[model samples]
Target: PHSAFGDGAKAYDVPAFGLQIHTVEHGSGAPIVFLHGNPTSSYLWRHIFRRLHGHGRLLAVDLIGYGQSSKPDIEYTLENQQRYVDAWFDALDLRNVTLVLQDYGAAFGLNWASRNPDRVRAVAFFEPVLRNIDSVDLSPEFVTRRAKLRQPGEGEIFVQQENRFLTELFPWFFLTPLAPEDLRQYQTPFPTPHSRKAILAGPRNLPVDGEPASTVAFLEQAVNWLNTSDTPKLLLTFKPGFLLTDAILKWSQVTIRNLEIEAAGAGIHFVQEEQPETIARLLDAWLTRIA
Candidate 1:
C-alpha cells in the first residue's frame, strides 16, 4: 500500500486552541480512533489504516504536538493532553470509539477513557505502560538519560533540546527486523527540533515521585479499571528483549484473560512499525469478537 504522508488530508482547528489537528478518515460504520506514541505521529497507523479502512471508519489523527498538527508553546501535561484528545472527539463529534493506544498514548488514552467510559467501546493496546511497579526497570541507557534530565538545573535544558533523543535513540527503538522503507517513514514526523518538544517531554513528564502525583494516580486507576472492568481490552506484545514485555505479560496474566494477549514476533518498542500487518490482524480479530 502507498504511504499517506503529505497526502491531502483535511485539517481541523481544535476549539479553544492554537493547534490544527490533521486527520485521515476512511471506510464507514463505527469509529476507531488510533493514537500514536511518543516521537511518532498518526503515520504509525498508516499501514493499519489501510488494512482497517475497509472494516470501519478509521479516524487516525495527529495529536496536538505530534505529526502535521499544530505545536503551540505549552506544557505537555497529562491534563493538557487529555484536553486536546477530548477536544478532538468533541470537535469531530466522535463516539463509540475503539481506542487503539500505545506507549504514552496508552497513558493519555486510558486516562481519557476511564473518565468517559460511555464513549469507549473497546480498547486495543500495544506495549502499554499501565502499572506503577518499580521492578519494571528502565533500560540502563534510559535511566542514565533520565537521570541527567532530572538533575538539578538541567530539566529545562533537557526539555528544550529538540530531536535530541529521536536523532540518537530512534535506532534503538526498533529491532534490526524492520524494513528500511518503514523505518524511514517512522522518522518522517520529527523533521525539525522545535516540532519534537512533545516527544521529548513525554518521557520527562513520567512522574517518578510526589511531584506529578495526579498523573501517577491516574495510571494506577487506569490499570485497576482495565483489570476489573468488563470492557473489552486487548494487549498486543512483541517478544525477546523488548523492554516491558515480560511485565506486561505478567500483568495480563493476573488482570486480563489469556485470550486477550496477542503476541507479535520478536521486535523492540516500535512493534507497530516492525509488524503492522500482524498488529492490524490481531486488532481486526479482537474488534470482530466484541462486535
Candidate 2:
C-alpha cells in the first residue's frame, strides 16, 4: 500500500492521550514532518516521501484513529487531535521542522504551529484550509454532496452504514479519477464500520454546518497568528479543488506573511496522489531554494 514509503514503521507512546501514534520515517539532514488527512494516514505521504528521501529526514504520521495508531474512544475534536500531535512533536523534540499539511492535517497542524511558532521552520500546504469555511463559500455542487454528511442520522448512514466516504466519496478527491486498484489501497485500513470511526469523525471535525465549533474557533485564531508569523510558507492550490475559495486566494495574495501561492495545474483536493511526480520535482527544488 505504501508504494513510495514502504521502508518501515515507527511507533510512539503518547502518555498525554493514552494512545500510540504510528509513523514512518526515512533519510536525514533537515527534519520534514508530514501530517496526513482524515481516513488516510502516513500512506498519503508515500509519493512525496520517495522523492525527498535523500534530501531530508522525511517523516509521516497517522493521527490517533487513522492508520495503525491506537483508536481510543476520544471525540477526535481539533483540540484532541492537536494535543496528541503536539505531544508527538515534543516527544521527538522536533526543532526547525517543516510541516507538510493537507485536508484534516492542515486543520490541526495550523492550530499547533500557530501556538508553537518557533518550532516551525516552514510550511508546505496542499489544498490546506487556512480559514474556517462554510457552504456559502463553496460551490453549490459540492455543497449539495456534503449535505448528507453534515446531517445527523444521514451522516452515519452514508459514511458508516453505506460506506460512502471511503468508497463513493474518496475518488472525488482526485481530479484524475483513480483506478480501482489504488482505491482499494486507501480503503484497506478501514475494513469495517467499526474501523471507519476516523472516517466518520473526519467530517464532524470539518468546519461545515457550524458543527466543528472547536475547529472554527482554532482556525479563527490561527488566521491571526499565521499572518503575524515570519515563517516561510507555501500554499499549493489545485484547479477544480474543493476548499480553495476566492476569499482565501485573495487572502493568500495580500495576507499570510512570507507566503507564496502556486498552482498545481489541473488536480483535485488530493493532489499528491495524482500529481506526485510534479510535486516531488517542484517541491524538491523549492525546498532546496527555500533553505
Candidate 3:
C-alpha cells in the first residue's frame, strides 16, 4: 500500500461502541499516545510519529469521526469521545502513557488523565481549550466563525456544504502554509457533507459562553485536575495565536502543578504541523529527562 503517512496505519474494533478506530504506529518502547483535535485525525501527528519512533511507541489515533475511523451517527459529544478513548487505550492495554493532546483532545484526554493519574506518566499539549473565560482571547473572526457554525442551520453551510473546516479553519493552524501534499492528506478524510458530521458537531464544546454546562464543566474538572496532579505537564504555545492567550500562560505558570510551559516561535493554533521536528526532538529530550 502507498502510505500517505510514512508511519503506516492500522484499524481496531472498539467493543463497547462496535466501531473501528484508525491509528498509525511506529517503534516499540514506552507508549506515547497522540490524540488530535477538531477537523483533524491521527494524520495531524504524522510527522512527529516518525521523528520519535526510535524513542518510544509512537501511536496516533483518529478520534471516532475525524480521520479513517468509523463516523457513526451518534451525538459527537466530548464525553463520548473520552469514553471511546478510554476504550481504545483499555482495549490495547496501553499503560505508563505520555499523552500528547491538542484542541479537543486536550479537553477529553486531560479529563481522563486527571482521573487515572497513575496511568499517565506525563502530558504535552498544544493550544488546548481552557475553562477560565478571561484566559481565552479568541479573535472576533474566529469567534464569529465558531458562532456561525454552532448555529443550527449555519453549521451545514459552513462545516458541511462549503467545507469551511478545511478551507477556512485549516489554514489558520499554521504560520507558514502547509505543503499542497500535506494539505491534501488532511483533506482526504472528509470529501462530502455526510463525512463532516463529527466536525460540525464539535463546536458545541468550545467553552465559549452559551455552550452546554457539561462541556464547560468538563474543562473545569480537567483544569482542576491539572492544577493538583503530581503529573508533569508541558504546554507549547505559538506567537500571534488565538487559543493561548497571555492570561492563559500566566495562570498556567502560577497555578498548574509541575507544569513547564514553553514558547515555540510564531504560529497559529496547530503548532504540531508547523514545527514537527522541533516538537519531536524536544519531546524526545523532554521524555528522556522526565523518564
Candidate 4:
C-alpha cells in the first residue's frame, strides 16, 4: 500500500488567506481535523488518519509554508497560521470538529477551539505545545542551544543554513528508528534556506519566561479553555515523552476537564511514527464513545 506520508496525498489544495493550504482528506461524517506543526506536514498523521478514515471526515492539513502548501512571503507567526487555518475551516464549513493535534499544531488547533468553543466537539493530542518553557525541566546545554536557536541570525544559521532541525534534531526525537524514505519525505519540503522560514519561525515563538508575550497569552487562553470546557479530551502519553513530561502530565490530570489519559507504550516525541496503531485504536474507541 502506498503511504500518504511517503507518496503524498491527492493534492487537495484548499484556498485560505490568499494562498492554498495542502491537505489530505478521506472518509466522511463529522469532521476530524488533524494538524501537525513545525518541519512536518499533514503527512505526520498518515497512519492514524488512515485508520480513522471510515469513522469520520478525516482532514489533515499542512501548515502554511510547509509540505505541499503554498509558502507565501510571511512572518509565519502563530497568528498567521491561525488565520489561515480559520479561513480553511470556514471555506470547508467545518463544524462539530474533532481535532487531532501534535507539536506546535496543538497551539494552533487548541487556540482555535478556545476562540470558537461552540464549534469544537473534542480534541485528542500528544506531545502538545501547551506548556510554558519554564515548566519543563531542561538540561543546561539544551537551554543554551534553544536560546541560540531563538536568536535572529543564529537561528537562521542552525535551522536554515545547517538544516539542523530536520537533519540533526528530528531523528533524535523518536525512540524507534525512522526509515530513510520517511526522513527524505520530511526533508524534501524544505530544500533551501529561503524555503525553511516556517521551520525557523517555530522555535522563536516558544513561550519562555513571559517573553514572546503574545504566544504566552495565546497559550493561556487555550489552557483556560481546556481547564474549563466540557469538551471531551483525550491525552495519549508515551514513555518518557518530550514536551508532555511527567510533571506536565500531573498538571493536566489535575487541571483539565472531561479528560481521558492513556499510556501509549514506548516513544519519545514522534509517538505517531512509533505507536500509530495504539494511537489510532485508542482514538477510534474514543471517537466511538463520544459519538
Superior by lDDT: candidate 1 or candidate 4: 4
TM-score of 1: 0.85
1-291: candidate 1 lDDT, tens digit per residue:
235522433434455365687776766788888888777878777777777765667788778887777887887877788788878888877778888988778877888887777887888887665655342455667756766765654644554454456555666667665566766766676566566668666666665433356656767766656765677888777765343546557866787632277677776787776787788888888877888
Candidate 3 C-alpha lDDT tens digits along 156-237? 8888898988886877656888888878878888888888888887765677753677777777777777888888888887
Name the weakest run of 10 consecutive residues (lDDT summed) in model 1: 1-10
Give the range where candidate 3 is weakest over 10 consecutive residues by summed lDDT. Answer: 1-10
Clashes of 3: 0
Candidate 4 residues 44-70, lDDT tens each?
A: 788887777677777889888899888
Task: Mark the 10 consecutive residues where model 4 has the least summed lDDT.
Answer: 1-10
* Candidate maximizing TM-score: 4
Pick by lDDT: 2 or 4, better one: 4
What are the TM-scores, per candidate, against the unseen true structure?
0.85, 0.91, 0.92, 0.93
Ranking by lDDT: 4, 3, 2, 1
For model 3, the superposed segments whose C-alpha errors exceed 4 Å read 1-16, 132-136
Model 3 has an lDDT value of 0.78
As a whole number from 0 to 100, the lDDT of residue 90 in candidate 1 is: 80
Q: Return the lDDT, model 4, position 65.
A: 88
RMSD of every candidate to native, in Å, equals 3.3, 2.3, 2.2, 2.2
